Design a protein around this ligand. Structure first.
Ligand SMILES: CC(C)(COP(=O)(O)OP(=O)(O)OC[C@H]1O[C@@H](n2cnc3c(N)ncnc32)[C@H](O)[C@@H]1OP(=O)(O)O)[C@@H](O)C(=O)NCCC(=O)NCCS
Ligand SMILES: CCOP(=O)(O)OC[C@H]1O[C@@H](n2cnc3c(N)ncnc32)[C@H](O)[C@@H]1O
Length: 633
């Protein structure tokens, strides 16, 4: 058995109770209609995607052609000639039909302190925030830096940017001032939106102070709009800082939506890679939205009356596509969850799902492991409407898949392990909720329009048939594919499209078993996934070298029972300090300062010299004889 994971792995059918309890009708009649539609999406994408786009997205001007360009040309364009606006499709068209339908359920950090926001209320808040940016000089095509925690104002900000055709560039609120600065400079943003403070798990995040530090080196930022989240006294810079609540009160509660081209940029999302600084992955407008709506509908079985709850942060692509764009495009309710799965206690996810009658839940296996370690007594909730259990970031493995399926889902929900990445925009290999039979540990089958191949890692040759393993690549473009790396299309080409010419390179290894099901093996480059966070080891090495006592640095990923992988750092010193215990703390702090707390290495080892650097020798072990003794200590 070449794909060793799939050996004697039975395939599980969709639970019968899923159909009998379903509030509506499934979007597909069964696996046969999936197969028909899938073959059409590969053999005639021009027809398949034109119909899908006209089903799901309201265009101001119809498009002339479904797709032009090729993978090797790096010139792909989708729905060319079309015009539309993302905020119109997420807000206006739903407010017009059903103004009092709840668009957003805000669950605050403290339980009992949220609110519900209707589509009409959302149109007001998006409109008047867009008025603020317009009045302060933001124009179509400008980037806007967003440094916000998980509050509904974050949705207001993304959609207000989209409404005027500004390009939002969301920076995860766990990033340091250095990381925020680098992203604001590269994007050349002149406007930033933040909070006075964030509250997460009962802890205060000093967002305004972090922004102040970053802006000292962003001289082109001329306004900082501050949302009063906590009311605490924060430093204030007159002439630059503005209060969200003071400014929006000045402006009307409606604003026209800017007419955007299908291929106008919608957002940038800075993303860590195998080498170099983070890349501003750029998504344009029509194709991204089509993919978001298509996966939201067919993967997550989203219907307009649903209450969809993605547990991912707006700072990441999961938050972009499935907290914001997909559910709002489809017109359902989305949950914005400010807290952690552990605050006030380990029942929190289920408290929220029960109070709001959540129908689909989307989670990371790290959170599941963390909760399973806490004990099954924290779960004692009916959650009658919960029929889809989504998982992302790493394979949800046997022990966790069983615990997610039995203890959380009561054998009534369909577990959908969705494989994708920032660069694909939306799900690309995934079961379809309520339709696709699954296997624990497997992402199952390609989504519509996704033509995956397994490549020999060295020769680059395609390996045909089933029970094969190698490099995961896609053979054809798809609507929501990232279109460039901001300011560096050559890097985009070299990273994704010139490695295996004619294919799109995922950076992941994979196996395709006897049934054609995919088994994601993980990154083949120097990217590690820690608590669902995509980290570059080269970035962490660069951060450690910023320390005055560090000469060389080597960072590797090692398996971790809770976080999947954990980053361990090896450092060689420049001259020799007599404070090695204290030096380790300053090294840890250096990474927390250069990147952010969440990227900190678990341990920083000090060696005389390092093994180009043979990182493979370090990853297996966790002067070759000396490091084995140094580790064994
Ligand atoms: C599982 C999870 C909830 C754990 O949260 P946690 O209790 O903060 O633990 P973490 O290991 O992530 O955090 C480590 C550090 O990052 C920081 N951090 C994490 N998330 C943060 C955020 N949203 N804002 C600010 N800081 C954050 C913590 O405060 C902590 O800092 P500290 O060293 O000063 O204590 C979080 O890691 C997570 O969401 N992982 C999943 C990512 C993902 O794949 N989401 C998609 C799901 S659909
Ligand atoms: C959506 C977050 O996208 P990113 O933060 O850009 O990380 C994307 C990288 O995470 C990994 N990955 C994501 N989903 C899965 C999964 N279901 N099974 C296995 N691995 C997965 C993979 O290595 C990919 O290349």
């Amino acid at each position: 058995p070449v794909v060793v994971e799939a050996h004697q792995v039975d395939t599980f059918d969709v639970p019968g109770v899923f159909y009998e309890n379903h509030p509506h009708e499934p979007h597909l009649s069964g696996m046969n209609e999936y197969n028909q539609l899938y073959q059409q999406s590969i053999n005639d994408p021009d027809t398949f995607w034109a119909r899908m786009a006209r089903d799901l997205i309201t265009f101001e001007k119809d498009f002339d052609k479904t797709h032009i360009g090729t993978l090797e040309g790096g010139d792909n364009a989708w729905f060319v000639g079309g015009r539309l606006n993302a905020s119109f499709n997420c807000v206006d068209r739903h407010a017009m039909r059903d103004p009092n339908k709840v668009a957003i359920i805000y669950e605050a950090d403290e339980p009992g302190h949220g609110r519900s926001i209707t589509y009409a209320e959302l149109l007001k808040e998006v409109s008047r925030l867009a008025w603020v940016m317009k009045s302060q000089g933001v124009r179509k095509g400008d980037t806007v830096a967003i440094y916000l925690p998980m509050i509904p104002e974050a949705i207001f900000a993304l959609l207000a940017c989209a409404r005027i055709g500004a390009i939002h560039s969301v920076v995860f609120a766990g990033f340091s001032s250095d990381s925020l600065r680098d992203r604001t400079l590269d994007a050349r943003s002149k406007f930033i939106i933040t909070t006075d403070e964030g509250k997460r798990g009962g802890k205060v995040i000093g967002t305004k102070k972090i922004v102040d530090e970053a802006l000292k080196q962003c001289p082109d930022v001329t306004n900082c709009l501050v949302f009063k989240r906590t009311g605490a006294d924060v430093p204030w810079t007159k002439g630059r800082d503005l209060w969200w609540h003071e400014e929006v009160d000045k402006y009307p509660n409606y604003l026209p939506a800017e007419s955007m081209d299908s291929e106008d940029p919608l957002f940038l999302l800075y993303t860590s890679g195998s080498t170099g600084k983070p890349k501003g992955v750029m998504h344009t407008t029509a194709g991204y939205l089509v993919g978001a709506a298509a996966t939201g509908k067919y993967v997550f079985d989203i219907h307009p009356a649903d209450r969809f709850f993605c547990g991912g942060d707006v700072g990441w692509i999961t938050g972009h596509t499935y907290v914001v764009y997909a559910p709002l495009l489809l017109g359902c309710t989305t949950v914005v969850f400010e807290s952690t799965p552990a605050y006030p206690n380990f029942s929190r996810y289920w408290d929220v799902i029960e109070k709001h009658k959540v129908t689909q839940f989307y989670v990371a296996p790290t959170a599941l492991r963390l909760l399973k370690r806490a004990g099954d007594h924290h779960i004692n909730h009916e959650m009658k409407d919960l029929r889809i259990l989504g998982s992302v970031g790493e394979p949800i493995a046997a022990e966790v898949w069983k615990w997610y399926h039995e203890v959380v889902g009561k054998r009534q929900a369909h577990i959908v392990d969705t494989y994708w990445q920032t660069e694909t925009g939306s799900h690309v290999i995934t079961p379809l909720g309520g339709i696709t039979p699954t296997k624990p540990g497997s992402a199952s089958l390609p989504f519509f329009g996704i033509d995956p191949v397994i490549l020999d890692p060295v020769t680059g040759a395609e390996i045909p048939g089933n029970d094969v393993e190698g490099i995961l690549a896609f053979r054809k473009p798809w609507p929501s594919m990232a279109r460039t790396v901001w300011g560096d299309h050559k890097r985009y080409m070299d990273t994704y499209l010139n490695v295996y010419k004619g294919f799109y390179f995922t950076g992941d290894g994979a196996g395709r078993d006897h049934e054609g099901y995919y088994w994601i093996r993980g990154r083949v480059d120097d990217v590690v996934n820690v608590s669902g966070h995509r980290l570059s080891t080269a970035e962490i090495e660069a951060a450690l070298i910023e320390h005055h006592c560090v000469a060389e640095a080597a960072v590797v990923g090692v398996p971790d029972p809770l976080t999947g992988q954990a980053v361990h750092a090896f450092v060689a010193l420049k001259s020799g300090n007599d404070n090695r215990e204290q030096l380790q703390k300053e090294l840890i702090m250096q990474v927390r300062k250069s990147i952010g707390p969440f990227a900190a290495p678990k341990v920083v080892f000090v060696i005389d010299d390092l093994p180009k650097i043979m990182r493979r020798i370090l990853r297996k072990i966790l002067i070759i004889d000396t490091f084995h003794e140094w580790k064994k200590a």
